[PDB]
């Protein structure tokens, strides 16, 4: 596998080269991409190819302050654009995201929220919104959960976390807490139940966004402005 070819195909920003390129040496990465490309030929695959890696383009590895783990992408057209949780601009936030945003507003009564769900502004500000499965068949959730993204994505996150300490991780729900277990002596690891309304604990009460900001300050890092609107 060839970085130049890989980068072109997915319109990956080159600043993520050193965390991602090592993946291409792994035979499982070659199977993953081949299997992904085979899905792409046999079925409608989401999000659009150019978006699968949109998270690379919003910020650079060095910009990343917070890591928020998703499972996989919305499977209805229009919704996913390559970030965890976030939807495209004129999509009404579904129950999970709407609860994420409610917690934000609870944590920050002053936060500017448009009533929209697109999280690009956070992404640009270093909030890495990353699903452990990067693709899905249109119509069928978790349909790609076992083709091998989790390994690939877990590698990239491992390399990211290794570069320097003092990331915040926000790990919401059992999948995320199981998949990603950062060294709590090195990073700030924040855990909660899933934001879906189906969760026993309402997510509206999650204080992660505040607690993460207090953490960054202790480390000389400017806090996130969690406003969804500019």
């Amino acid at each position: 596998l060839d970085w130049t070819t890989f980068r072109r195909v997915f319109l990956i920003d080159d600043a993520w080269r050193p965390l991602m390129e090592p993946e291409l040496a792994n035979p499982l990465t070659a199977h993953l991409l081949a299997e992904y490309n085979r899905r792409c030929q046999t079925e409608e695959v989401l999000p659009p190819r150019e978006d699968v890696f949109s998270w690379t383009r919003y910020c650079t590895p060095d910009e990343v302050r917070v890591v928020i783990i998703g499972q996989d992408p919305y499977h209805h057209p229009g919704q996913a654009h390559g970030l965890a949780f976030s939807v495209r601009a004129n999509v009404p936030p579904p129950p999970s995201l709407r609860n994420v945003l409610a917690a934000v507003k609870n944590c920050y009564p002053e936060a500017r929220m448009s009533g929209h769900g697109c999280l690009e502004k956070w992404a640009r500000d270093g909030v890495l919104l990353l699903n452990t499965t990067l693709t899905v068949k249109r119509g069928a959730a978790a349909s790609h959960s076992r083709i091998g993204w989790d390994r690939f994505v877990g590698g990239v996150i491992r390399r990211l976390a290794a570069r320097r300490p003092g990331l915040v991780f926000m790990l919401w729900g059992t999948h995320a807490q199981n998949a990603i277990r950062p060294d709590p002596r090195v990073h700030c690891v924040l855990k909660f139940s899933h934001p879906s309304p189906l969760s026993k604990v309402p997510f509206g009460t999650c204080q992660h966004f505040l607690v993460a900001n207090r953490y960054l300050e202790t480390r000389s890092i400017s806090p996130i402005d969690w406003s969804v609107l500019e």
Binding site: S96, S193, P197, L198
Partner: protein, 109 residues
Amino acid sequence: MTLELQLKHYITNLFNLPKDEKWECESIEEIADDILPDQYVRLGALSNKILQTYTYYSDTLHESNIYPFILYYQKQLIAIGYIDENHDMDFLYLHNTIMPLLDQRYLLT
């Protein structure tokens, strides 16, 4: 009539919502232990099982804080019901992959 249409009729009738309002559905997976009441989750039945979860939403459902849902496990029906504002879960159906625990689907009519 699809299950989810039966559920929608039961709901819009129970809470007197606009019957013809479009509902949208959020479909995600999560472990039964993190969703169901403790009394419905045992080792060797629903415990540690990943349910495929369907949660319905609209403007008036949001206004209501009413969350209708249908849960599956590998295409086995597991639950139909709804959660309210205070997280009181109501069930019209529950199966623990071993047997039916609760079947009040006749309520839908």
